[PDB]
């Protein structure tokens, strides 16, 4: 119970953060992104396994969640590292792209503008490092409805992370009306993260020399299962 | 004053869309599309009745209506289907159960997302008052752009949020549960958004039916 306590939880999520990912480049932009995602997914699995209680859900829910949330989590990570640089998307240490470069590949410019607009909203709200840690965890736990309708366990976990975020916002010292307003503003942004995620998935599956992230993810998920 | 919690909920109540009868004189997708086209007309009227909506720039109004329509229709569908598991009450003469979704390809998947989200609202015992606030929030939170008149949209969205927070408060539950319920409700919005994106994808990937999107744009120019 205590390992899920507001303060410990945030610190545990902190240490659980993924390492920097170097794409290491010897169609192409899409080849870079795809090779980057594949690499991040490996670390995303490790990250999820570090969230207190995640490993104690049925493997079925673990897989359900990971398969449903990956694109949202990657994008949430992207928005957070791009947060202080308007007009830019810091995908990785050797892959910084600005809005315009999104004109090369068709359909990508639209997605970039969604990510840049959602990122601008997090900057305006002045998203805190620990609010970000809670939100990203919530994105994983709230990615799939089915595993909730072990279900008892997922609901408990989702509430723990929410309590943690409510706690984080509380020590912000702001009024009670503002605390509710901030919680609501943060959670309403999840809809936009989900939205950019669906567009990214759609664009990815409408694609035809790049890396097969989804299938590689399923391989990782099976290994996670074995 | 019209944005005050109690007054706002009562105003949203009266603003509710009327029942919509498609009046089939046979394609499921043909019925669905004829229904949506009819609902959209009433959805515009509904939005105009939300206190302050008509005062945003026509730019934001059009912006919000264009991107939220599918989410609002689905939020409406889930609310009327809430007490009947395995079924979707699309309209007074169009009740469809899950399996009828196997006919058209790609639809069963969407029906299951809708039935699952509806299932979740039933479990949370979504109230009429909460539903009225959430649906208004779906419209106001549909597009990020008109927010990043913006001052006006932000204040409007906050007003509806206060109303929901107020609704939850008179629930008489503890403060920890109040935060938990607000959070549980708002997280469901991600799922409504999700079923909405799937429905939009399927509609455009669709191949003897009605062009809802173009008709909506006509209504928007009329607006
Ligand atoms: C294999 O995915 C490539 C990929 C293919 C695609 O069609 C669409 C996308 C892809 O990578 C996603 C991505 C997001 C965050 C990351 O940290 C990494 C990748 C975003 C990047 C821009 C659109 C979307
Ligand atoms: C013109 O829309 C037809 C339509 C075409 C489509 O490809 C997908 C969908 C459509 O109607 C939507 C709808 C939702 C709520 C309503 O009250 C009415 C329609 C949902 C119904 C199931 C999938 C999605």
Swiss-Prot record, chain A:
It is found in: Nucleus. The keyword Phosphoprotein applies. One of its GO terms (molecular function) is estrogen response element binding. Composed of three domains: a modulating N-terminal domain, a DNA-binding domain and a C-terminal ligand-binding domain. Nuclear hormone receptor. Binds estrogens with an affinity similar to that of ESR1/ER-alpha, and activates expression of reporter genes containing estrogen response elements (ERE) in an estrogen-dependent manner. Binds DNA as a homodimer. Can form a heterodimer with ESR1. Interacts with NCOA1, NCOA3, NCOA5 and NCOA6 coactivators, leading to a strong increase of transcription of target genes. Interacts with UBE1C. Interacts with AKAP13. Interacts with DNTTIP2. Interacts with isoform 4 of TXNRD1. Interacts with CCDC62 in the presence of estradiol/E2; this interaction seems to enhance the transcription of target genes, including cyclin-D1/CCND1 AP-1 promoter. Interacts with DNAAF4. Interacts with PRMT2. Interacts with CCAR2 (via N-terminus) in a ligand-independent manner. This is Estrogen receptor beta. It comes from Homo sapiens. The gene is ESR2. The chain holds residues 260 to 500 of 530 of the full protein.
């Amino acid at each position: 119970l205590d390992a899920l306590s507001p303060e410990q939880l945030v610190l545990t999520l902190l240490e659980a953060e993924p390492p920097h990912v170097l794409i290491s480049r010897p169609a192409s932009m899409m080849m870079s992104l795809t090779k980057l995602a594949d690499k991040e997914l490996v670390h995303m699995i490790s990250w999820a396994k570090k969230i207190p209680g995640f490993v104690e859900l049925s493997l079925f829910d673990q897989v359900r969640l990971l398969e449903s949330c990956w694109m949202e989590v990657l994008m949430m990570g992207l928005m957070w590292r791009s947060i202080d640089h308007p007009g830019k998307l810091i995908f990785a240490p050797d892959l910084v792209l600005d809005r315009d470069e999104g004109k090369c590949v068709e359909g990508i410019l639209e997605i970039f503008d969604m990510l840049l607009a959602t990122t601008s909203r997090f900057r305006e709200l002045k998203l805190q490092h620990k609010e970000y840690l809670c939100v990203k965890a919530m994105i994983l736990l709230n990615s799939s409805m089915y595993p909730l309708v072990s279900s008892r366990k997922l609901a408990h976990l989702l509430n723990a992370v929410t309590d943690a975020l409510v706690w984080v916002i509380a020590k912000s010292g702001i009024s009670s009306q503002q605390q509710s307003m901030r919680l609501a503003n943060l959670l309403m942004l999840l809809s936009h993260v989900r939205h950019a995620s669906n567009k990214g998935m759609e664009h990815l599956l409408n694609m035809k020399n790049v890396v097969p992230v989804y299938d590689l993810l399923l391989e990782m998920l099976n290994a996670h299962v074995l």
